Amino acid sequence: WKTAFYAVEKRPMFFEQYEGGSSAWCVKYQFGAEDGGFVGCCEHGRILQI
Amino acid sequence: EANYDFLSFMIGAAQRSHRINRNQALMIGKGVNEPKGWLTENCFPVFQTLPVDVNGTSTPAFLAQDWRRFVTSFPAEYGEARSVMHQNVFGYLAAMVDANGRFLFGDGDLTFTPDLVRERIRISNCLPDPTEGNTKGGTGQDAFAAGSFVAAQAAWKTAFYAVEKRPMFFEQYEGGSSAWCVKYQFGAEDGGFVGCCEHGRILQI
Amino acid sequence: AAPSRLVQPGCFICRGVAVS
Amino acid sequence: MVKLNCRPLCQAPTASRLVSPPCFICRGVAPSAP
Amino acid sequence: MYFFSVDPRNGASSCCCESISARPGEVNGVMVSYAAWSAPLRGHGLTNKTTFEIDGVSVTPPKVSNAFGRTKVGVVFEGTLSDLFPNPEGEQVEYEISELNGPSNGVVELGANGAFTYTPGALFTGVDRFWFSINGNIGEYVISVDPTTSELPQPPFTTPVYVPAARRSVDPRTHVLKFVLGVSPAAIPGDVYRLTVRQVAIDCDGNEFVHISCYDISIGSCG
Amino acid sequence: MYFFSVDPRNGASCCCESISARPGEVNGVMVSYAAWSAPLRGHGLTNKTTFEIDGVSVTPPKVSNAFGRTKVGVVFEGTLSDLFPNPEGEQVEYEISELNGPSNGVVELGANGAFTYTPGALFTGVDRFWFSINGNIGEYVISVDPTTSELPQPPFTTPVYVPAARRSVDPRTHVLKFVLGVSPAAIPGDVYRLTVRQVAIDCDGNEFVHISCYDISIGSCG
Amino acid sequence: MNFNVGVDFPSFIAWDGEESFPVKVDGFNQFGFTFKTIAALTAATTFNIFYHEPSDADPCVPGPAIRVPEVPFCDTVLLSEDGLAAVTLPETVTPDSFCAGTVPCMNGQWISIAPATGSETNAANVQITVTMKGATR
Amino acid sequence: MNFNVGVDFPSFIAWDGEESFPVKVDGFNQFGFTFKTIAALTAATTFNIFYHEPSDADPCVPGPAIRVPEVPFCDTVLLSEDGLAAVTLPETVTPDSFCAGTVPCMNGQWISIAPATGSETNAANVQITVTMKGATR
Amino acid sequence: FFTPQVLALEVDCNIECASLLDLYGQIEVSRSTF
Amino acid sequence: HPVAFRCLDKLGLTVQSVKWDVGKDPQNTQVGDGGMSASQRKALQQILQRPNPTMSGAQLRYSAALSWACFGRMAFKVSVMSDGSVNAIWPLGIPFLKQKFDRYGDVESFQYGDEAGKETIPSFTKVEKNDKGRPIKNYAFMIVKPSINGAMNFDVQ
Amino acid sequence: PTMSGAQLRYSAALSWACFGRMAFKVSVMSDGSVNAIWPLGIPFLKQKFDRYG
Secondary structure: OOOOEEEEEEEEEEEEEEOOOOOOOOOEEEEEEEEEEEEOOOOOOOOOOO | OOOOOHHHHHHHHHHHHHHHHHHHHHHHOOOOOOOOOHHHHOOOOEEEOOOEOOOOOOEOOOOHHHHHHHHHOOOOOOOOOEEEEOHHHHHHHHOOEOOOOOEOOOOOOOOOOOOOOOOOEOOOOOOOOOOOOOOOOOOOOOOOOOOOEEEEEEOHHHHEEEEEEEEEEEEEOOOOOOOOOOOEEEEEEEEEEEOOOOOEEEEEO | OOOEEOOOOOEOOOOOOOOO | OOOOOEEEOOOOOOOOOOOOOOOOOOOOEOOOOO | OEEEEOOOOOOOOOOOOEEEEEOOOOEEEEEEEOHHHHOOOOOOOEOOOOEEEEEEEEOOOOOOOOEEEEEEOOOOEEEEOOOOOOOOOOOOOOOOEOOOOOOOOOOEEEOOOOEEEEOOOOOOOEEEEEOEEEOOEEOOEEEEEEOOOOOOOOOOOOOOEEOOOOOOEEEOOOOEEEEEEEEOOOOOOOOEEEEEEEEEEEOOOOOEEEEEEEEEEEEOOOO | OEEEEOOOOOOOOOOOEEEEEOOOOEEEEEEEOHHHHOOOOOOOEOOOOEEEEEEEEOOOOOOOOEEEEEEOOOOEEEEOOOOOOOOOOOOOOEEEOHHHOOOOEEEEEOOOOEEEEEEOOOOOEEEEEEEEEOOEEEEEEEEEEOOOOOOOOOOOOOOEEOOOOOOEEEOOOOEEEEEEEEOOOOOOOOEEEEEEEEEEEOOOOOEEEEEEEEEEEEOOOO | OOOOOOOOOOEEEEEOOOOEOOEEOOOEOOEEEEEEEOOOOOOOEEEEEEEEEEOOOOOOOEEEEEEOEOOOOOOOOOHHHOOEOEEEEOOOOOOOEEEEEOOOOOOOOEEEEEEOOOOOOOHHHEEEEEEEOOEOO | OOOOOOOOOOEEEEEOOOOEOOEEOOOEOOEEEOOOEOOOOOOOEEEEEEEEOEOOOOOOOEOOOEEOEOOOOOOOOOOOOOOEOEEEEOOOOOOOOOOOOOOOOOOOOEEEEEEOOOOOOHHHHEOEEEEEOOEOO | OOOOOOOOOOOOOOOOOOOOOOOOEEEEOOOOOO | OHHHHHHHHHHHHHHHOOOOOOOOOOOOOOOOOOOOOOOHHHHHHHHHHOOOOOOOHHHHHHHHHHHHHHHOEEOEEEOOOOOOOOOOEEEOOOOOEEEEEOOOOOEEEEEEOOOOOOOOEEEOOOOOEOOOOOEOOOOEOOEEOOOOOOOOOOOOO | OOOOHHHHHHHHHHHHHHOOOOOEEEOOOOOOOOOOEEEOOOOOOOOOOOOOO
16 A cells, blocks of 8 residues: 555645625635545556455 | 756666676576576576375375475585575465465565575576466466476585686776767676586475 | 376385274 | 557456365275275 | 570571470469669669560360459358350269468368358458369359458459569579469460560660560479 | 769760669769869859750650649649540559558549549648559649648649759869659650759859759659 | 647547548648557558648648658667658557557658558548647747 | 657547537546637637536446536635636637636646636637647556 | 655565576686687 | 797786885875875875785786786776766776767777677766866876877877 | 976977977966976967078
């Protein structure tokens, strides 16, 4: 697995109050993170099926 | 240009192509233009197992009892001998099962991983394997093509000699190379022969 | 050398009772 | 001098079976009958 | 391997066309040295723009006719051999399948009376021919094995004498032409064909110098 | 390659020289004007040679030539029977000589004096092919135009010709070179005459003319 | 987040299976083809490569079609018997696989592809387009 | 010196004037169109964009034709009525001139272009084609 | 306008086979035909 | 060759016979002595009498003179540890020794080997020098015999 | 650098023997302090005279 599939890390989550749209009667938060991954070369792994 | 250094890739992809080719030649090289390999010369005293009657069908087979008689029958007067085989074969012996259902090696471990250098087996998965890669062999019927090769055993330090005369060399082939295009030339000189037909052995089906 | 066989001992168990 | 270069768009899987040695039968049991 | 030094077209040194002897079945090679003609014409040597033509000046049209069949992969093919020998007079038919000119990727067995069966080799698709011999007279039976999908095209019923499609060559360093000449096993001994060659050189700027010669191929048996 | 050393005009069977020719060939000729130009010490020879061809035995052609036109990519079809007026009544075995077929297309000769000419893809120019009716050889020329207007009409190359510009004269060794091509429609036995007028030059810029003749004999198979 | 890759490597159609098209390659400096079939082929297909020149009547319209010469590097051993560059799409190409290629030396202002004689009925099942590189002007 | 750019930004056909062709954008991660006209147009020409899914039966043949929605880009005003992507080649665009559009965020695995209704008359003179950016195999 | 971060990995997946050249007897030689 | 080999080994033998030592030079106008530490001079004395292991100074002298007579060239290799103190000295095979030049006028590095051997040993010209000038990493010498038309390093042997 | 006084004397006398000439070059810093000397290849050396002598 150290060379069969890769995981890509860029940035963890954040949290900040959305100012526009949050009046003095409502309030709206906003969050998100960014990451991904891929498969290096699927010649290093097997699957056992029935 | 072309940031990825190509020349270093080619010299690396030339010693590699040789390394597998010399290994392939010394095994099954056919006479002219390639050293006579010990697998094709066929001087080694060759032993073939007997079939088993699966409900009166007599299919070819190879059971653990055969492998013990093949390694212990080696005359200890020749010296210490090592056995070479394909990794599917060693996996084949590791998966044997007796009539009651248990395993013969490692009576319950989910795996059999013994000390190989203490058993003189030297797995090299380019020798021909009787499992046709995999997905063949070990059946009730419709597998185990009779007459195949499984493994060998010999005092290799004296049963087969390797000859080296002038190994790999690279040089810019001056002539045919102009001020805008280079032509490289590489080469090597080696060979091999068998030492004593009476020191090895081969197991068949 | 000609291919020689490797006949090994089979299931040898009994010496005093034949089966029916 | 054109030298082509081709790749496949949808690679295909590759299945295969995993035949394993059968339970032992032995070449003749001593106490037996014809 | 024949070798002809062609005339140099300098106004100096029975039939005019040279002779070439061939035996039915053989496939030989011929060399032609245009050095004496193209070396004074200082240019870029010869070019691969040669053309060949085969004309017959004596044929003696064949007695038996050929036949073409169709079949798919793996399926056995059956056929007869009696409707291929138009005999003006009455005589027995000694059917024979020559062992030398048999099929290439299959196998046939000759029946007792104009029968044969072509069972193609397993996992094989293409075209396969074999040469029968009806009472000394020789013909061919061409069968194409289709990969069961749709159909195959028609082969051209190879001629008695032919030059292969693309096996010619030329070396501009020594001004030599090399080509292959193959004769069918059905060529009748005693006949004569004519082969013409058009070789074109080239000057330094890309123009052309044409040159035509001829050769008499007399198909003679036993060497 | 032919070679002729010309007489230097020093007062020291026929007069014109002999040249053999074969229908279809394109050969080269050399003339060594050294004997006549070297004593006239000047600036050597000049590229002002002039040729002329006459026929002293013609045997006029039986079959007439013909010309057509078509746009690029468009297939062209025509007839081949109205070009051979036959005096007697007999059969006609039309044939397209493979050695002199088209160069940028293909022709499908039907059974009876009919053909269709498919030009090569994306080709604009002229193309020729030499048919043969009852052994009589004649050329058929087809011009593929680039769909805009037209291309000019080629001059129906003669039985024996000298190309437009392939001649060269070396003033350092006084040798003239040229090309002599014989059409595939030439008739064996015929004789033509090639007259050559070569001009030298003095140190000041005056001329020294020199005239010679040659007899071309169209012979078969060498 | 995909970009407008159109500008900065644009592409045009060079052979739609029925008629060719001349493509201008003056404004760019590097280019190549991307072959692609639509149906299973029957035999090896060969295409000819042509280059144009700006016409005397108008410098914004291609003139006649000349054939690009052939340039060998070192490894060439075929030489295609004519000294005229040409591509040859090999048999056994499933119609979900593209093939790439280009000439080593451009000449003129335009480039065009056309099916060679003999393989004019199989070229109706293939598609050939051209993509260039950074613009000089 | 020109590089063989058929790999590393290949190109395929999407509308040859008579038929749309779904192009696979799975193996790549960026793509765009490069419009091109062949003759003077009559009026504004509008094209629809469609994205496909892997078919239920065969996993690398395109399924049905679903229309990709359109998203704003922080300053949009037009806001095409039925929230669906569309490209409008403006009138008075001469030949020998190409533009380039690209749908901002991708969905599906096959993308396609088709002439919108009421504009398929003068749509036979344009030829859209696609070029991807970067293999991710 | 957007330059990708060129990472420093290079995948391969290309088994040789396995070495079997150290068991055999080794003898360095001279001009051929010993 | 009999006579050629005889003259060569005589020439190598006689040169190999002399005994080395470092010493104060006669033309010592440089009162600012270049005996930087007086310990590197001791180590240099060590290395001239005991070179790289499995080789003595005599064999170094023999190989140097032999190669100088055969090709007109002399090359070597040093292993200065970190402070101008040379660690070991190696002679270089001249037949298969290649060098690369700078843009201005001189050689900068030496390549020793075609494919695997690719040690681009820098010249003494450009190398990490100490605060006084003495190098800190390896280098080579490339001693050359002069010839006509100059070309100090570009000329024929 | 890359040349000692012995090699300079050798090159000078050799060119003096073959051609009867000797040429050199100096790199005086700023104050008569000569910094470096180079021997000059005499075969391909060209020189330009003044108007007087």
